Amino acid sequence: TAPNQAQLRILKETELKRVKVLGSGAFGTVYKGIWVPEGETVKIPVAIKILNETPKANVEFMDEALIMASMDHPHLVRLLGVCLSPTIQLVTQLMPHGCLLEYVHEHKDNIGSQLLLNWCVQIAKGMMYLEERRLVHRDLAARNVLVKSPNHVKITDFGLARLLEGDEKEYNAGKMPIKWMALECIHYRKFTHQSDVWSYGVTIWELMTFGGKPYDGIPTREIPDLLEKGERLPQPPICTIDVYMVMVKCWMIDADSRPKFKELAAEFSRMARDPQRYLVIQGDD
Numbered sequence: 498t499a500p501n502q503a504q505l506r507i508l509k510e511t512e513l514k515r516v517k518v519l520g521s522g523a524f525g526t527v528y529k530g531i532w533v534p535e536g537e538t539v540k541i542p543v544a545i546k547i548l549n550e551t552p553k554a555n556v557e558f559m560d561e562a563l564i565m566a567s568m569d570h571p572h573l574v575r576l577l578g579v580c581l582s583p584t585i586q587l588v589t590q591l592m593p594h595g596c597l598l599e600y601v602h603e604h605k606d607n608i609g610s611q612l613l614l615n616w617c618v619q620i621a622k623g624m625m626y627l628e629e630r631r632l633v634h635r636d637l638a639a640r641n642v643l644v645k646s647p648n649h650v651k652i653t654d655f656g657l658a659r660l661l662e663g664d665e666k667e668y669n670a671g672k673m674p675i676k677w678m679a680l681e682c683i684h685y686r687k688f689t690h691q692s693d694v695w696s697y698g699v700t701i702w703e704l705m706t707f708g709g710k711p712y713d714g715i716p717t718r719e720i721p722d723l724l725e726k727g728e729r730l731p732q733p734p735i736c737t738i739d740v741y742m743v744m745v746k747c748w749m750i751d752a753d754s755r756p757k758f759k760e761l762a763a764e765f766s767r768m769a770r771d772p773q774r775y776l777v778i779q780g781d782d
């Protein structure tokens with residue numbers, strides 16, 4: 498593997514102004530901010546993520562920062578962006594419209610097939626680049642896709658992301674939710690680009706259901722057995738069989754036979770050219 502000479506930019510605190518909290522909870526807190534780069538005049542709208550005040554959490558936050566600093570893809574969040582005082586804070590370009598999961602909930606009456614299919618394309622496009630860099634996300638979900646503008650989304654939350662090396666074709670070990678993980682990850686902790694493909698299935702299913710909760714009301718405990726029996730997520734009411742089939746191909750038992758991100762991008766691209774062919778939504782063309 499080629500050596501990684503990405504440049505990590507260390508930001509002085511005086512360069513950053515925190516304006517508003519965007520979100521908080523167990524994971525830590527994200528702010529909206531202005532960043533003025535040393536020593537320029539331009540004001541860059543910014544997201545500033547810190548941990549809440551609680552062993553390996555700081556080290557891993559930095560690992561996450563390294564990943565975001567090493568890539569330049571239109572559909573992957575890029576670090577700007579690290580400040581150290583008074584605690585670690587990751588600084589990324591502001592995504593005005595928040596996370597995609599909430600976005601599709603709020604605007605459900607307003608979202609057409611064109612945007613939904615396009616999101617399938619972009620997310621698959623981002624994941625594609627991750628494959629080329631041999632990075633397994635391990636935690637792909639609609640809550641980890643952010644919205645820059647209606648027709649431009651980015652994958653984020655690389656905190657559990659792992660870089661495959663040498664001959665390694667899987668990663669073995671975090672707390673990504675079981676309802677989005679591949680059956681072989683549940684059983685053998687066998688994380689690959691192909692398990693990510695499963696997660697993508699669930700992700701795009703969250704979209705077609707306008708922020709549906711997968712297997713809703715079924716305890717996590719019962720999930721492994723549900724999926725052993727062959728049960729999968731239902732056909733969303735807007736989905737033609739063409740679209741659902743793609744989802745079902747991602748949830749097949751043989752990981753290797755699953756479609757690849759490269760193939761999923763090309764396929765949803767084909768659908769994107771005639772959207773109303775493929776998703777059937779009230780009030781749309």
Ligand SMILES: [Mn+2]
Nearest residue numbers: 715716717718
């Ligand atoms: Mn539960």
